[PDB]
Amino acid sequence: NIIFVGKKPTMNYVLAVVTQFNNNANKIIIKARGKTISKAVDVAEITRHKFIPDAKYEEIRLDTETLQGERGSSNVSSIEITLSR
Amino acid sequence: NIIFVGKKPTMNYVLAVVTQFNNNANKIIIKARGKTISKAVDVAEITRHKFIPDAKYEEIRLDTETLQGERGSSNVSSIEITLSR
């Protein structure tokens, strides 16, 4: 029930979301890290504009996730977007 | 009270946020659109983890906005993060 948004074209992820709503999941979670946080927002916005006109934001969580490191190495921002209805 | 996260380095925006909190602001809004939605999340996560450890997510709003593109109108994702104490 979780869609990890990665490197595929955006519409793949929009499709994954729609597919799962039409097998009556009530909640969908979209999750992304780093640069692709932009794309996760796109996925959710396209979905509710063109394809599930009644989708609403249940909640949005922002976090940081820790990465294996060399000194100076970075961690990474993450988003989790919950949709329903 | 409104910081538009654009092309400058992340730490510049962190600085503008932390300054405003040091001058006793209650609510800070960070806005970004497109690719730099990633950078906005960065600004707020770093601020929270490293400078204002009691800064809270009051509200997170995802939207779509339009801009003059290369070829007529264009739609981009936008984010509005409200941090508070």
Curated annotation (Swiss-Prot), chains A, B:
PTM statement from Swiss-Prot or TrEMBL: Acetylated. Acetylation at Lys-7 decreases DNA-binding affinity.
One function term, GO molecular function aspect: double-stranded DNA binding
GO terms, biological process: chromosome condensation
Record's subcellular location: Cytoplasm; Chromosome
Top-level taxonomic group: Archaea
Taxonomic lineage: Archaea, Methanobacteriati, Thermoplasmatota, Thermoplasmata, Thermoplasmatales
Function: Binds double-stranded DNA tightly but without sequence specificity. Involved in DNA compaction.
Modified residue annotations for N6-acetyllysine: K7
Pfam families assigned to the protein according to its UniProt record, in alphabetical order: Alba
Record keywords, A-Z: Acetylation, Chromosome, Cytoplasm, DNA condensation, DNA-binding
SUPFAM superfamilies: AlbA-like
The name this protein goes by in its record: DNA/RNA-binding protein Alba
InterPro entries linked: Alba-like_dom_sf, DNA/RNA-bd_Alba, DNA/RNA-bd_Alba-like
Family assignment from sequence similarity: Belongs to the histone-like Alba family.
Source species: Thermoplasma volcanium (strain ATCC 51530 / DSM 4299 / JCM 9571 / NBRC 15438 / GSS1)
Keyword Plastid: no
Principal subcellular localization: cytoplasm
One Gene Ontology CC term in the entry: chromosome
